[PDB]
Amino acid sequence: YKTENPLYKDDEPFAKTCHTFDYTREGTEKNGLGYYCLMGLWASIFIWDSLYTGATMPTGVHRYVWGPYFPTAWF
C-alpha cells in the first residue's frame, strides 16, 4: 500500500454548508506589495530628509522652458 506523511499534507478546507467560512476574497492573509511600497517610501523619506537638509527650504527662482503652464513645469 501507499501512504502520505501527515506532516506534509495540505490544510483541510472549510466545510461547505449554509454557514461557510471564506477568506479567499479578503486579501488579508499576507502583506501585499502596497505595504512593501510603504516601507520603501519610509526608508526613502528617512534617507532623503537627512541627505538633503535644504529641500524643505527651496529656491523661488524658476525659469521653466515652455513657461509655467506646461505640464513638465509642475514637477
Least CB distance to ligand LPP at residue 60 (A): 21
What are the residues binding another protein (CB under 8 A)? 1-3, 6-13, 15, 17-19, 46, 50
Nearer to another protein, 47 or 73 (CB): 47
What are the residues binding ligand LPP (CB under 6 A)? 27, 31-35, 37-38, 41
Nearer to another protein, 18 or 65 (CB): 18
**37: partner contacted, choices ligand LPP, another protein, none (Cβ within 5-8 A by kind):** ligand LPP
Grid coordinates of 73: 513645469
Place of cell 506532516: 7
What's the 3-state SS for the chain?
Answer: CCCCCHHHCCCCCCCCCCCCCCCCCCCCCCCCHHHHHHHHHHHHHHHHHHHCCCCCCCCCCCCCCCCCCCHHHCC
